[PDB]
Amino acid sequence: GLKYRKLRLTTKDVNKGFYKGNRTGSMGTHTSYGTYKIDYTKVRTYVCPDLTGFKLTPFVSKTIRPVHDQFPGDKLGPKNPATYLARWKSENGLD
Amino acid sequence: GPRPTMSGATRLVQKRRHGFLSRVKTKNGQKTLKRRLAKGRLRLSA
Amino acid sequence: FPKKGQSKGGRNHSGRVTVRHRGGGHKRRIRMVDFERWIPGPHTVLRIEYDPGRSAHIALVKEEATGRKSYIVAADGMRAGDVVQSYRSGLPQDLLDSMGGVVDPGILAARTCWRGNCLPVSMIPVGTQIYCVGSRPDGKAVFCRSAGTYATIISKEEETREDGTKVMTGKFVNVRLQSGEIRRVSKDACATVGIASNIMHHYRQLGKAGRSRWLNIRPTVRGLAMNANDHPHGGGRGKSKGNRHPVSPWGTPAKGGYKTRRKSNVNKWVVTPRVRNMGVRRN
Amino acid sequence: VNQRMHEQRHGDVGNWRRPKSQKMMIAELAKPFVWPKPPAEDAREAFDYAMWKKQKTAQEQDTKFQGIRAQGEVVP
RNA sequence: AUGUAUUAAGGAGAGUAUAACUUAAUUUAUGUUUAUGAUAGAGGUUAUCAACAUAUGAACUCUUAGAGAAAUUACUUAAUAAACGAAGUGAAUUGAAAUAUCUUAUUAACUUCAGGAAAAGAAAUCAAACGAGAUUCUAUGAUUAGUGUGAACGAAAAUAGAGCAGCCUAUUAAAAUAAGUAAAAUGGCUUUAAAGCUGUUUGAAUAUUGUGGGGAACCUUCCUCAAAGGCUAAAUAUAAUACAUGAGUUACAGAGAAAAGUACCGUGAGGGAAAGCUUUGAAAUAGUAGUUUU
RNA sequence: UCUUACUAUAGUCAGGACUAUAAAGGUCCGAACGGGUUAUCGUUGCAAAGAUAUCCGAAGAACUAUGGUAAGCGAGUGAA
RNA sequence: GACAUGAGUAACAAAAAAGAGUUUAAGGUACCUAAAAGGUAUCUUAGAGUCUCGCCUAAAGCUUAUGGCUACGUCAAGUAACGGCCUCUAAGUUUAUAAUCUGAAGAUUAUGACGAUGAGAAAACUUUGGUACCAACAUUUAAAAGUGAAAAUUGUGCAGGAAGGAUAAACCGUACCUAGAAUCUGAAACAAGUAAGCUAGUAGAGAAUACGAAGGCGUGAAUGAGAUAACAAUCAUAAAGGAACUCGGCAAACUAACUACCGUAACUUAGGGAUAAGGAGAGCUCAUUAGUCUCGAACGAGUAAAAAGGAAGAAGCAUGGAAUAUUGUUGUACGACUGUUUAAUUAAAACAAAGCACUUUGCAAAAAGACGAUAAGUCUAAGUAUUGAGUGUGAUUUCUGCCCGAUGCCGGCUGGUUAACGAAUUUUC
RNA sequence: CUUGGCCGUUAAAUGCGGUCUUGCAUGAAUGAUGUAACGAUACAACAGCUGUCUCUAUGAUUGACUCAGUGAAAUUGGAAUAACUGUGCAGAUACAGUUUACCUCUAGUUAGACGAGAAGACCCUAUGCAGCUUUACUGUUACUAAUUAUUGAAUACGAUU
Ligand SMILES: [K+]
Ligand SMILES: [K+]
Ligand SMILES: [K+]
Ligand SMILES: [K+]
Ligand SMILES: [K+]
Ligand SMILES: [K+]
Ligand SMILES: [K+]
Ligand SMILES: [K+]
Ligand SMILES: [K+]
Ligand SMILES: [K+]
Ligand SMILES: [K+]
Ligand SMILES: [K+]
Ligand SMILES: [K+]
Ligand SMILES: [K+]
Ligand SMILES: [K+]
Ligand SMILES: [K+]
Ligand SMILES: [K+]
Ligand SMILES: [Mg+2]
Ligand SMILES: [Mg+2]
Ligand SMILES: [Mg+2]
Ligand SMILES: [Mg+2]
Ligand SMILES: [Mg+2]
Ligand SMILES: [Mg+2]
Ligand SMILES: [Mg+2]
Ligand SMILES: [Mg+2]
Ligand SMILES: [Mg+2]
Ligand SMILES: [Mg+2]
Ligand SMILES: [Mg+2]
Ligand SMILES: [Mg+2]
Ligand SMILES: [Mg+2]
Ligand SMILES: [Mg+2]
Ligand SMILES: [Mg+2]
Ligand SMILES: [Mg+2]
Ligand SMILES: [Mg+2]
Ligand SMILES: [Mg+2]
Ligand SMILES: [Mg+2]
Ligand SMILES: [Mg+2]
Ligand SMILES: [Mg+2]
Ligand SMILES: [Mg+2]
Ligand SMILES: [Mg+2]
Ligand SMILES: [Mg+2]
Ligand SMILES: [Mg+2]
């Protein structure tokens, strides 16, 4: 080989026991017989909420112009923990 | 004269003899990497 | 257990040839021969087998007490069914009681000095042939283990007991080895009565080169056949010895009587050293 | 998994590399599903297929004219 | 190229608004000044028509848990290149017109250990009858004293400059003032024979009320210092970044690289390109035309 | 990853003949395979070692595959 | 670096091979027609296909590997109809641990981990040591017969022939190319080289030789069409003579294979020589037939049954008909022999070799030998004087004589010499 | 020396085989010597066979040649680049003299251009190298010997005297 040999080796180039995964994750364990037992505590699910009646869409009308928020006098305007706590007492005090 | 010494050459021997792990795991292989890294090589091994 | 690896080719742990003219032989297995024979009691010879890594034959014995099997260097004439016994771990109560005394040299030899029986050299009478002679009090057999070899008991450090019965006084006994050397050995050293089997081994002929290759022996290139760079004997136009005294590839005299035993290592067990032929033709 | 051709970083210049592979999955549905048929070339005016087709021929003829120069030839 | 300032772990893979950089790949806020700045509109993709300062969300895989054929597996709030420093080990080409001592050379290289620097350092130092006052770096002293058959190698005192800092109660936590040590013989190193370093075998003394070391073989007097215990910044070395300067380069120059350690060559270590822009168009060479000769 | 030797795990040798064997032979003739005796061609070659014919071994000291080990002060390997 | 010359020259020649039709897309010309268009024909570029002919064919075919600068819609719980990953371990590796050795680097031993070229349950539904073992060779065995495997059974020979573990379906590979026609290595589109299985049939002992069913091919203009001089290569035939050629029968020709055929010398280590030499036979038709097989009804008939068969017969120049197997004998030297060697100018008389001989090695902690900046330690060897190592010779028959002065080695004196050490001495300042 | 003497083989023998010896300079494990078998070893002879030859001829294919297409290389100081005799760093297309030749190509051929290529080959030189050898010079090791130290004793005998 001259040049293709200097490329990064891939699983589609050789077959003599060369295995390289795609980072799909471990979904179980290997057995001693050559099989695989899927561990469903490692398998992942996708929590999709019911979208029946949901009116919001991924776009906002361009008639409403984009204006950023303002927090005069506070350097940590949006990240102020006091503003989050003080506002919590006003709206929801129980939880 | 030159000979066809790469006839029947397998890529398993390339990784074993010239691979990255053959060097980071040896005293003399760390020099090759450090040497090739000082020169700016992209292909440090194989 | 199998005998494999690069050691079969004459290599050491470095991978370089340390023993020349080796490799490519037939696949073999090592036999675990019992050279100590500590377990007492009768042992029934099951069969005499052939051992490739040994010139003499081995005997598969069976301990009648427990049934465990073991290998031992078979004697000349030992056949299946023979009952061998090792009195190295002490004499059994019956034998002592039959005499009724601590020991009797004549009585003991008549009931234990049988072919294949392993005894301390002190118990074996003078003039008897043994073939598994040890050196240390609790060591394995090291001498005369090869085919057809044996040793004779020359003398024993003993004294008369006023009744014509000799009793051991010293700690060693002299024995003539296969090489004709009369050296000193421990009183409690083991020995087997008889001669090593396969006495006609050295009379064999291989007939062809291929048989030596099967025995893990590779060709031996002479020094005269090499160049002046590979051997002190190489060089010269045509057949020429170069007026150079015979030596090894590393300068060791190969003839003339040069002894390779380390000088500082003096043999303190030798009573009569070997006879040197001095290069004179034997026949 | 469908691999990708090895290419140079910047086309005709740069180091050699290989993009990330592509993965396709074929699911065995419990209920059949049939796709619609592609519109006829005469019914693609909503996508401006007329203008797109002209630009395509110009590109196919430009790569074809470059492929002739790659063979060391020229159009008489 | 040099100088000045600042800083003290480096790379790769794949992916992505192809000026915008990490699956959030153009995050979200504050203050000030806004043409007398800084150095009374239109425009949220027909975008970023605002700079400075201060905060802030995100920031994948490998080098880099273990394994393994680095960018995989399997797990997990696993993580530090080179150059420079010190000690140890230590050549040869070369010169002597050969060549052994010598020189090359306390060199190159390798190994260990360590930090942003390190090492060294406040005299058991030098001087010479007067005195100087730690260490480090540069110059002179000096093709000197001197050694060596030769070839060559080669100090120190002192002076000038850069820095300047002293101490043990060390500005980070250490000594009850140092014995198998000083020193001798012998085998070596260094070297001028001294001093210093060292394997082996031996082996001291107790302070100027003159005890110990040194002052270039050695003895003596005198002078000077006080080993066998320690701490210490700066001037210095290297690398990266920024800026300044130029009878420095302007594309076969500068650098190896104006898209480079890439392409390409080699199994490998390793070797290693060509290539600027819209300007100008020299010679050689080729096919013709005019005059002329054949 | 060539090549020499060794090593581990494996594989291959149509058919026929002689010999004491059904199987005991570095046996015989001869393909595959492995060699490279002789001649011609070729020599800026198809080929920095090739082509054609001829010839040798072809159950063995055989041949082949995938890995492994041993090389550069001292010399690794070497039927030399 | 550019551009000249050789030169528009050589080359595009693996002794497979081409011929005539047809057709698609885009584009270029000519005419028809001047309403643009379209149509007819032709050419260029990129393809496809039909008929005929030929070449390869135990391949130049098909299915897959090693590999890949060919291209990315290549789809699996497992078996039938699959590998990897995963479990186990070999040869080995180890900046893992402990101990030990060591100028540093490091090395050694043990354990662990890793490491295939091997071993891994079930399925057309599934989840002790010959009481042995699964190296080679031979034999036997899935009951109609034969053949080829698998596994097992039995036995033979010596060269005496692994290890370890056990016993509701993730992830990765899947495309194409296999070297005579576009893909691997040989700097390349190279007459070279590369692994596995399959690889029609006739005919044979056969994978030999010849034909060749399917398949593929008869190269990317990297060529095509003519002409058939010298000369060259590769072949064919040949009057008379038959080595007169030549350093030399170099090359070529003769011969050749087959049979349960006949016959076969000197010499011999009694095995051979020997397939010696030298002869005979062969295809087609047919008389004839004990059994086997078939048919009809013991017997009869039959080769549209295999075979046997004879001094039978026919035709032709010729019946080993085409292709395939390259002479015989004799005297010597050298080396016993089969083997090995300068990859790519010397294959041999050289090396090796069985045999023979000599020196060395007693194993009590290191047998000797070899390796170890140098040791621990390793190979030797889980060997023991009939063992291992070194040296020369080189099967066997018949033999191997003389000299120990020189050289080397070995042994030996309470000897001579004798550095260190040291009785006794001696000198500078 | 030498084609040693003789014998056999050839019409003709520096060869080959047998034999004899005075063997410049055979010789016994740097083994001596004689057979069987074996050999792509080397030498010689016989029979057969043939284009090896007397002595070549014809035939076949692929090249060679022409047209169309594509398109190299070594090499080249520059060239209007004949013959002879002479000359001359000593072998002339190029100088001297005389002679001869209209201009330009194609296919053949290789006598010359001391043709091209390869520092290929030989000899010599360098106080240039490498490898090898040894009773070369100067050194280092394996190895041997003595001894301080680790490490303390007892007895006997012999030797110097
Ligand atoms: K000199
Ligand atoms: K001087
Ligand atoms: K002090
Ligand atoms: K110009
Ligand atoms: K044969
Ligand atoms: K031509
Ligand atoms: K065939
Ligand atoms: K699977
Ligand atoms: K070390
Ligand atoms: K081929
Ligand atoms: K011939
Ligand atoms: K060979
Ligand atoms: K010999
Ligand atoms: K003598
Ligand atoms: K002598
Ligand atoms: K003597
Ligand atoms: K010529
Ligand atoms: Mg592939
Ligand atoms: Mg592949
Ligand atoms: Mg694996
Ligand atoms: Mg080479
Ligand atoms: Mg190979
Ligand atoms: Mg040997
Ligand atoms: Mg031998
Ligand atoms: Mg030999
Ligand atoms: Mg030689
Ligand atoms: Mg020598
Ligand atoms: Mg000679
Ligand atoms: Mg990781
Ligand atoms: Mg890791
Ligand atoms: Mg100075
Ligand atoms: Mg003090
Ligand atoms: Mg001292
Ligand atoms: Mg002094
Ligand atoms: Mg001194
Ligand atoms: Mg001092
Ligand atoms: Mg003085
Ligand atoms: Mg440049
Ligand atoms: Mg310019
Ligand atoms: Mg044979
Ligand atoms: Mg030629
Ligand atoms: Mg033969």
Ligand SMILES: [Mg+2]
């Ligand atoms: Mg020409």
Ligand SMILES: [Mg+2]
């Ligand atoms: Mg021509």
Ligand SMILES: [Mg+2]
């Ligand atoms: Mg047209």
Ligand SMILES: [Mg+2]
């Ligand atoms: Mg494992």
Ligand SMILES: [Mg+2]
């Ligand atoms: Mg495997």
Ligand SMILES: [Mg+2]
């Ligand atoms: Mg190719």
Ligand SMILES: [Mg+2]
């Ligand atoms: Mg080819």
Ligand SMILES: [Mg+2]
């Ligand atoms: Mg094909």
Ligand SMILES: [Mg+2]
């Ligand atoms: Mg064709």
Ligand SMILES: [Mg+2]
């Ligand atoms: Mg004729």
Ligand SMILES: [Mg+2]
């Ligand atoms: Mg005739």
Ligand SMILES: [Mg+2]
């Ligand atoms: Mg003649």
Ligand SMILES: [Mg+2]
């Ligand atoms: Mg003649």
Ligand SMILES: [Mg+2]
């Ligand atoms: Mg007739």
Ligand SMILES: [Mg+2]
């Ligand atoms: Mg031979």
Ligand SMILES: [Mg+2]
């Ligand atoms: Mg042979």
